[PDB]
Design a protein around this ligand. Structure first.
Ligand code: BCL
Ligand code: BCL
Ligand code: BCL
Ligand code: BCL
Ligand code: BPH
Ligand code: BPH
Ligand code: MQ8
Ligand code: UQ8
Ligand code: CRT
Ligand code: HEM
Ligand code: HEM
Ligand code: FE
Ligand code: SR
Ligand code: SR
Ligand code: SR
Ligand code: SR
Ligand code: SR
Ligand code: SR
Lengths: 318, 60, 317, 258, 280, 40, 60, 60
């Protein structure tokens, strides 16, 4: 038996914290805090305050506009029947301009809402980018997040804007809908001859698997050395303790090498940014450079051959 | 009026601020909802092109 | 709940399709396989007719199709067409009472055309219909109107300000998926292009759009569902386009696709002027044919029962 | 001639660039990995008197300096750390053999009981007030509505015996939470810290179980050079002792099972 | 060789099994009884994957035989064999390599366990590891069993196993609609998000702008509270990430456990229960 | 609700008038809707 | 009235503020719930063309 | 009925800043929504082809 540090079993409150203080120029903070005994059951119970500048307001603004075009459009596709909207919601979506239009700005009823929602969404994501760089500067900190967000933004941009512009057709960006965007994904692999044989998509998959591997390992570690205040990673990084020691040693004795309280955060950091960056590269070469990845894999001798036990005659060849 | 006398006492049991803001929330929601409902039906007043066919007075 | 939800028990019936390890396999519910079999029971044949007699075209007045039949055989052929297409109604369904030779009732101008439809089918489409062939029951099943006939549908409502998504809805016609909900009109009526895969690794010589890919995906979902199978039944998903890696069913389905284009184009659209509103969709298009119409969720209509070989009156010349 | 298919496509060379950037990345990460624990301990080093400092591939990165806030100091990595004797003796004289703790295992400060020498100063709030302090020093703190107050529960060890009673609750002034339980020990009424990580509650009984050590061992809990605050040195020291009990506190945790 | 602070912890005992028998180190790896069982399972496993590569699907001289890394592949027996042991050169080999893989992962897990007992740390890691071991087992033991034959397992080959995933995935037409698949995918994506956020944070505070000192807990909470009005806090973020990644593995295991044994139809069709509620 | 016995009678009265007034505007709107286009 | 006996003591067991707020919520939900159920079946009272057609009152 | 002899008291119960910002948001939103709805029906005022042709001839 032993506490697992899964659920804070006994909590404590103190007057809320408005936070470390920001320099002149960085506007006031808004909202005044509250505590959720239940968030508290598992984490900091404090909820907010939040910061909102020109940036933050222009981003929340654009973002909600974009959310409205997508939604309103979805209600329109079901005739303003909020019931039907509720019924098929998962299947509802706002499709992209048709190819007939190329990269021209299309009519409202033929895709223009998508281009506007795509436009406003992008501006709002990139404004949130700027937001995190400002919020990160007010604290003297570094832009590590911003270099990652910038990577995920990279993938996003490659998906809905960069590849489309390169391919000369807004119909190639992804449509806003749950099931619609799932279908876009499958069709994407199909159209280019099975994306499994795309090296970049294999790497992105090794890196997604790796984010789960590393965070599960590290996270389990920090809990296993939580007993020695290993969660307090900052001081174990400046002033190594037996938590960071037992931590580095568990792995050392297990897989033969190890890292440090500071470096594991770099392996993890670099592994996540890598997912999105192989991922985006992966979508970049599809249609722009390679049109049929399976064939590509055959040309580079990577696709396995199996005894042909089942086969079909080609009517196109009769 | 068919109601209680000890009916004000409810405001010693339920926070008044919440009930007030809440009513507005719920009513605004219901309002929008029903509006969209009617608009989705036979009772619609928008999708028909009357009294001057704005979509076919200079179009069609 | 947030119910839970949709579920079968183990073990499923399974069949190995491709090579071991390739993953080309099939799963199915044994129970429901049995229910489908009882629902896909075939009608036994009527005793052969000896005949030995004159040809139908010699003893009858308006015999433009079942000419070369002996009288006996013609009569038999009439009894099969009666139970097969409209048994609750009997003989009178397609004939003006007291007058067997008359065409003064539409169901006969149609019946006649369908005699040329089955015949063309049994005699010209074996690369598709093999030796099982087809018969009236295949589509009719004791019903005057194939239950599983289709129509070009308009999807759900749109205000006037905006045009339809063309895809994005809950439809049993695309397997419940959100692809485009009418992959039939452009593929099983018209003959739009299904191919989207490139034949070259590098690009610059394949104009297939992604959209087209989705239409092909939708249609394929349709097909899959109509025959009641998954893609490893006809494909090796590492290469949907690779014919050598596909199953001989892709070949068969290929010829079937063309076949439904012929039933729908030269046998069904033409009957549209003599058919009642009761038999027509919102665009005035008439109820036509699809794979489901006949297969009704089984890889071979009625589990590959051989009905037609017993009625010689169903073959050309 | 308009068909000379090139065998090299952008996809090959992008896979090439990737692997090269990869190798440099891997190498680099392994360098940040040697900012502690290095060079290694062999008898390769001792045999040669030290002429073989063990570092492997890649090598060690130039030191980096951490500038602690609050007149706190400056730390470097990698650094040169003074060796420290091992309070144990080799189970075998052959290399790679484990060592047996010297003396009374919970006292040894070897094994699950070992720990390093962290500063003999305190971690600080942003402001600079002792981050971890007791609720008696941190006036504001308060149990969360609906949580048994640990204050007054009975602390009980691994064998059942009462150990002491909760005399107070230590809290983080930086991230508000219970870090340490205070224990007025029964056998001598001395006050000791008990890490939250070692403590289980039995709210319906107001007990606070501790599998770590036996009720008795609570007598030897490492001590604080001040009952109103604690240093980094002292935290490791407190916890490692309890941890030792996980392998020591009984004549059975030593393992085997079979 | 040891870390510069390692000797002081390299205690004797803590085993589950072996006791002083295998209670020693080799380089930095801990051996232990399970390191030996593990190494044996592992070595035979790999050495057999080498022999499979050596022989090929039609014999060492045929064109399908190969030593190319992308294409070497060892596949299960046909379904005709059910749960019986199949001949060696017909998927038997694949079965034995599997037994070795399961045994090696389990030994590895138990050896991490003895290592927790030695170092005196929580056993969160090998418990978490056991989730991957579980997923692997459903993909080779549970599902193919529930499915009456071992051949339902995936082949061991770098891309050929990708092909397994592909055609199995496609038997259900549009796998994306698998709801457990939707979950697991959600966790895998979010896990990848929190990790990038924690990673970024630790590195943003212990190394701030020049002119600034190592940052504080107060900063940490203040930044993410600044951005998104909330900060789950240091301990817990380590807790969440563990939750996300273990759950992601969970739902992968269940999403594949239901694809066959408990559902045979296409997956989009599953969502019918929703379009047919008596609400619409 | 940390209210006294009197500040819920005052509140309640004002609430009642505002609410019934609301229902009044409501019936007004509902009769105009019924006149221009009967729905039952 | 009551259920019988002593159905007042129930409020020494169940929070009156919560029973009230909960019931208000539940009744609101059950209401939208059923309205949505009946409109979704044959008993619809909106999309009937009763008592006079509305979309082809905007047609002739 | 118009207004209570004491409906100022509502601001002793409700914050003037939140009510104010709230009203602003809701009205701005409603302005937008309604505009979108009108823009999606017959009453569209943009694509009428009136009062003078702007796409000369055909293509565009
Ligand atoms: C359908 C069958 C195809 C398939 C087709 C694709 C396609 C196509 C793609 C992937 C993509 C990827 N695939 Mg895949 N994939 C296949 C099967 C798999 C399998 C598996 C076990 O079989 C796995 C593990 C994966 C794994 C993955 C991930 C590794 C990768 C994307 C990571 C990610 O989250 O990016 C997602 C993260 C982001 C997009 C950034 C998110 C940040 C944005 C900006 C957030 C903004 C938030 C917003 C503003 C909030 C408001 C909401 C608004 C309403 C919008 N695929 C098969 C072969 N896969 C990518 C790829 O490989 O391309 C080469 C991709 O685009
Ligand atoms: C084929 C097309 C279908 C589809 C079909 C399938 C099928 C089929 C499956 C998945 C599976 C999954 N898919 Mg998919 N999938 C689709 C598209 C996607 C997309 C996407 C963006 O489109 C994504 C993100 C994913 C992602 C996922 C995850 C939800 C899941 C895999 C994680 C896992 O298995 O954990 C499990 C992790 C492990 C089992 C590893 C265990 C480790 C063991 C114990 C030790 C390994 C040791 C070994 C020796 C290590 C080597 C080290 C050497 C010693 C050096 N899929 C497409 C649309 N997908 C798989 C799944 O559900 O998981 C069971 C599955 O069966
Ligand atoms: C369906 C066919 C008819 C239709 C028939 C009806 C009928 C029938 C009714 C309406 C009613 C409504 N219609 Mg109409 N309506 C039609 C066409 C329209 C169109 C349009 C673009 O064409 C619009 C904009 C509207 C708009 C409106 C709303 C103004 C109104 C409901 C008020 C509400 O929800 O608030 C909800 C209420 C509140 C939120 C609280 C009320 C205010 C309180 C009392 C103020 C107290 C102070 C408070 C504490 C602070 C206030 C601040 C808050 C932030 C607000 N109708 C179509 C043509 N319409 C309703 C009406 O007229 O009013 C009864 C009604 O019953
Ligand atoms: C389908 C066939 C009929 C139909 C048959 C019925 C039937 C049958 C019923 C309704 C009901 C109602 N119908 Mg109807 N209804 C029809 C068509 C409609 C249409 C429309 C657009 O055509 C509308 C808008 C409505 C709407 C209405 C609502 C006014 C009412 C439901 C109140 C409720 O849910 O409980 C809300 C709960 C309460 C008000 C409880 C009061 C709470 C007390 C005061 C709690 C004290 C605490 C504190 C003091 C206040 C609590 C806080 C509150 C939030 C203020 N109906 C169709 C045509 N309708 C119900 C009704 O009774 O109407 C009279 C009902 O039983
Ligand atoms: C390593 C790559 C991973 C990654 C990294 C990543 N994501 C990031 C970041 C990073 C580094 C950020 O910095 C940023 C972030 O903020 O992190 C928490 C972000 C982000 N990750 C998110 C999404 C996201 N990332 C994803 C993926 C990934 N991102 C990868 C796994 C995914 C996927 C594919 O599953 C998603 C869904 C967002 C929360 C955030 C970017 C947020 C953003 O750009 O905002 C844009 C606009 C809005 C949110 C509009 C505001 C709407 C408000 C929520 C409503 C509030 C209204 C209020 C009541 C006001 C009143 C309204 C008035 C108008 C009336
Ligand atoms: C469950 C949540 C996540 C997770 C957690 C996790 N994995 C873990 C751990 C944890 C906590 C460990 O502590 C343990 C570890 O050592 O850390 C790296 C482990 C581990 N994660 C690894 C693998 C792994 N985990 C993965 C994923 C996951 N693991 C999830 C993302 C994945 C994938 C598919 O994404 C892989 C590949 C190992 C490096 C390691 C355990 C190593 C080990 O057990 O070694 C003993 C066995 C051998 C050395 C090989 C045995 C020899 C075999 C007989 C031959 C191989 C047969 C194999 C079946 C063939 C497959 C061939 C493929 C090419 C298809
Ligand atoms: C004949 C006969 C006898 C045979 C001869 C035997 C032979 C061939 C000898 C060769 C021997 C050699 C060369 C090697 C042995 C090979 C062995 C047994 C196999 C290795 C198996 C193994 C698990 C390798 C996996 C490698 C990888 C990349 C694993 C993924 C994990 C990951 C990404 C690794 C790096 C990150 C790590 C290690 C993080 C752990 C880690 C985490 C997670 C923290 O949180 C933490 C917190 C605070 C301080 C430290 C740490 C810390 O170290
Ligand atoms: C210094 O450290 C740091 C902090 O501390 C200061 C931070 O605050 C921060 C900021 C971090 C944040 C603000 C965290 C924000 C969290 C995010 C974005 C994650 C998003 C997650 C969600 C929205 C929740 C999704 C999940 C749910 C709603 C519950 C789902 C429940 C389900 C599915 C049913 C439950 C059952 C299961 C899942 C099956 C069984 C489960 C398992 C087997 C898993 C086991 C898990 C454990 C933990 C042992 C960072 C980055 C940091 O690094
Ligand atoms: C009733 O509802 C009310 C509240 C009104 C509102 C409800 C709204 C709701 C519920 C909306 C729901 C929306 C959902 C669920 C949306 C889901 C979206 C998903 C899942 C999308 C997935 C992928 C989409 C992608 C990748 C889109 C990419 C698009 C891009 C990158 C577009 C870029 C366009 C740009 C930058 C435009 C440039 C314009 C220029 C300047 C070039 O024009 C000249
Ligand atoms: C047992 C009931 C039936 C009997 C006794 C019967 C009898 C006959 C006879 C005697 C003829 C030849 C009439 C003539 O052309 O002079 C004929 C023709 C024809 N009957 Fe039938 N009939 C029956 C049912 C049906 C049914 C159910 C259908 C359609 C579903 C049908 C479709 C036709 C058609 C289309 C012709 C013209 C044949 C041709 O051009 O080849 N009959 N029937
Ligand atoms: C739901 C998963 C399925 C998908 C994604 C799918 C996808 C495709 C795709 C992409 C093609 C075109 C290949 C190219 O671009 O050159 C194709 C062709 C074809 N598929 Fe399917 N398919 C599925 C199921 C089926 C099924 C069940 C059958 C048969 C019953 C089938 C029969 C065919 C045939 C005959 C062709 C060739 C048609 C032609 O070339 O005109 N497919 N499929
Ligand atoms: Fe961490
Ligand atoms: Sr107009
Ligand atoms: Sr199936
Ligand atoms: Sr050879
Ligand atoms: Sr229904
Ligand atoms: Sr009208
Ligand atoms: Sr113009």
């Amino acid at each position: 038996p032993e506490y697992q540090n899964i659920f804070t079993a006994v909590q404590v409150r103190a007057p809320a914290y408005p936070g470390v203080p920001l320099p002149k120029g960085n506007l006031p903070r808004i909202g005044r805090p509250i505590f959720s005994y239940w968030l508290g059951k598992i984490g900091d119970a404090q909820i907010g305050p939040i910061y909102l500048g020109l940036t933050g307001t222009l981003s929340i603004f654009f973002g909600l506009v974009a959310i409205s075009i997508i939604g309103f459009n979805m209600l329109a596709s079901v005739h303003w029947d909020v019931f039907q909207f509720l019924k098929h919601f998962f299947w509802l979506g706002l499709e992209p301009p048709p190819p007939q239009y190329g990269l021209r700005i299309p009519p409202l009823s033929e895709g223009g809402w998508w281009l506007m929602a795509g436009l406003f969404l992008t501006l709002s994501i990139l404004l949130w980018w700027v937001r995190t760089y400002k919020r990160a500067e007010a604290l003297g900190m570094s832009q590590h997040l911003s270099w990652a967000f910038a990577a995920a933004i990279f993938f996003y941009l490659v998906l809905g804007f960069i590849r489309p512009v390169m391919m000369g057709s807004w119909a190639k960006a992804v449509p806003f809908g749950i099931f619609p965007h799932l279908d876009w994904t499958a069709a994407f692999s199909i159209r280019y001859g099975n994306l499994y044989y795309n090296p970049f998509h294999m790497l992105s998959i090794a890196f997604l698997y790796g984010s789960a591997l590393l965070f599960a390992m590290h996270g389990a570690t920090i809990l296993s050395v939580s007993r020695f205040g290993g969660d307090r990673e900052i001081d174990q990084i400046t002033h190594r303790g037996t938590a960071a020691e037992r931590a580095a040693l568990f792995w050392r004795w297990t897989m033969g090498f190890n890292v440090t309280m500071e470096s594991i955060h770099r392996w993890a950091w670099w592994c996540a940014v890598l997912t999105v960056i192989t991922a985006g590269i992966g979508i970049l070469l599809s249609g722009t450079v390679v049109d049929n990845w399976y064939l590509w894999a055959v040309k580079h001798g990577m696709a396995p051959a199996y005894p042909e036990v089942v086969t079909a005659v080609n009517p196109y060849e009769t | 009026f068919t109601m209680n006398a000890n009916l004000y006492k409810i405001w010693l049991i339920l926070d008044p601020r919440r009930v007030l803001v809440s009513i507005v929330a719920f009513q605004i929601v219901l309002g929008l909802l029903i509006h969209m409902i009617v608009l989705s039906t036979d009772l619609n007043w928008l999708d028909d092109n009357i009294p001057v066919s704005y979509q076919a007075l200079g179009k069609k | 709940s947030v119910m839970l939800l949709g579920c079968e028990g183990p073990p499923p019936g399974t069949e190995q399709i491709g090579y071991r390890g390739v993953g080309m396999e099939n799963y199915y519910n044994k129970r429901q396989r049995a229910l489908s079999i009882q629902a896909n029971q075939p009608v036994e044949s009527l005793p052969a007719a000896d005949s030995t007699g004159p040809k139908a075209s010699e003893v009858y007045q308006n015999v433009q199709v079942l000419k070369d039949l002996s009288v006996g055989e013609f009569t038999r052929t009439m009894v099969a067409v009666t139970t097969w297409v409209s048994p609750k109604e009997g003989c009178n369904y397609c004939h003006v009472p007291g007058n067997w030779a008359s065409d003064d009732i539409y169901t006969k101008v149609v019946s006649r055309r369908m005699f040329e439809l089955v015949r063309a089918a049994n005699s010209d489409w074996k690369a598709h219909v093999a030796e099982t062939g087809v018969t009236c029951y295949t589509c009719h099943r004791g019903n005057p109107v194939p239950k599983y006939a289709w129509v070009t549908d308009p999807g759900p409502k749109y205000p006037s300000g905006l045009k339809p998504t063309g895809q994005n809805y809950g439809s049993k016609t695309v397997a419940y998926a959100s692809l485009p909900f009418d992959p039939l009109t452009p593929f099983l009526d018209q003959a739009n292009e299904i191919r989207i895969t490139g034949n070259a690794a590098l690009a610059g010589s394949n104009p297939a759009s992604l959209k087209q890919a989705e239409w092909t995906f939708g249609l394929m979902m349709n097909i899959s569902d109509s025959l009641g199978v998954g893609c490893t039944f006809c494909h090796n998903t590492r290469a949907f386009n690779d014919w050598t890696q596909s199953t001989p069913k892709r070949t068969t389905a290929w010829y079937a696709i063309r076949h439904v284009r012929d039933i729908n184009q030269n046998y069904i659209w033409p009957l549209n002027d003599v058919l009642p509103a009761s038999r027509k969709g919102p665009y005035g298009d008439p109820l036509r044919v699809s794979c489901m119409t006949c297969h009704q969720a089984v890889n071979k209509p009625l589990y590959g029962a051989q009905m037609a070989k017993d009625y010689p009156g169903l073959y050309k010349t | 001639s308009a068909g000379i298919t090139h065998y090299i496509d952008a996809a090959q060379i992008t896979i090439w660039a990737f692997w090269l950037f990869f190798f440099g990345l891997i190498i680099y990460l392994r360098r940040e990995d040697k900012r502690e624990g290095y060079p290694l301990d062999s008898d390769r080093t001792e045999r040669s008197g030290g002429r073989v400092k063990v570092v492997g591939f890649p090598d060690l990165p130039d030191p980096k300096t951490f500038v602690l806030p609050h007149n706190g100091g400056t730390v470097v990595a990698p650094r040169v750390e003074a060796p420290v004797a091992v309070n144990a003796t080799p189970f075998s004289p052959a290399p790679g053999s484990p060592l047996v703790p010297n003396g009374d295992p919970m006292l040894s400060g070897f094994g699950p009981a070992a720990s390093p020498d962290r500063p003999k100063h305190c971690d600080l709030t942003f402001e600079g007030l002792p981050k971890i302090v007791p609720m008696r020093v941190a006036k504001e703190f308060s149990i969360a509505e609906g949580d048994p107050d640990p204050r007054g529960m009975t602390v009980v060890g691994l064998d059942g015996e009462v150990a002491g009673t909760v005399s107070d609750v230590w809290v983080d002034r930086s991230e508000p939470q219970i870090r340490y339980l205070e224990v007025e020990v029964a056998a001598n009424k001395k006050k000791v810290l008990l890490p939250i990580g070692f403590s289980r509650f039995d709210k319906k009984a107001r007990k606070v179980k501790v599998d770590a050590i036996k009720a008795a061992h609570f007598a030897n809990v490492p001590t604080l050079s001040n009952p109103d605050q604690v240093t980094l040195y002292e935290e490791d020291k407190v916890c490692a002792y309890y941890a030792g009990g996980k392998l020591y506190a009984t004549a059975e945790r030593a393992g085997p099972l079979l | 060789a040891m870390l510069s602070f390692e000797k002081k912890y390299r205690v004797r005992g803590g085993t589950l099994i072996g006791g002083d028998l295998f209670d020693f180190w080799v380089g930095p790896f801990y051996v232990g009884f399970f390191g030996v069982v593990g190494f044996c399972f592992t070595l035979l496993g790999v050495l057999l994957i080498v022999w499979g590569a050596t022989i090929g699907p039609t014999g060492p001289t045929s064109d399908l035989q190969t030593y190319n890394l992308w294409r070497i592949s060892i596949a299960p027996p046909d379904l005709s064999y059910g749960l019986r042991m199949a001949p060696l050169t017909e998927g038997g080999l694949w079965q034995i390599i599997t037994i070795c893989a399961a045994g090696a992962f389990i030994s590895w897990a138990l050896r991490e366990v003895e290592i927790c007992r030695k170092l005196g740390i929580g056993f969160h890691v090998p418990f978490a590891f056991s989730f991957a071991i579980g997923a692997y087992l459903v993909l080779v033991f549970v599902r193919p069993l529930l499915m009456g034959a071992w051949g339902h397992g995936f082949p061991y080959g770098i891309l050929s196993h990708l092909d397994w995933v592909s055609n199995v995935g496609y038997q259900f037409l549009h796998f994306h609609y698998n709801p457990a698949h939707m979950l697991a995918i959600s966790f895998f994506f979010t896990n990848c998000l929190a990790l990038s956020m924690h990673g970024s944070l630790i590195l943003s505070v212990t190394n701030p702008q020049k002119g600034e000192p190592v940052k504080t807990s107060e900063h940490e909470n203040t930044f993410f509270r600044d951005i998104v009005g909330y900060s789950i806090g240091a301990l817990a973020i380590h807790r969440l990430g563990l939750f996300l990644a273990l759950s992601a593995a969970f739902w992968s295991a269940v999403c594949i456990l239901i694809s066959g044994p408990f559902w045979t139809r296409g997956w989009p069709e599953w969502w019918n229960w929703w379009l047919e509620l008596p609400l619409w | 609700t940390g209210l006294t016995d009197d500040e819920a009678k005052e509140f309640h009265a004002i609430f009642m008038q505002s609410m019934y007034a609301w229902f009044g505007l409501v019936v007004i709107a509902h009769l105009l809707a019924w006149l221009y286009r009967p729905w039952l």
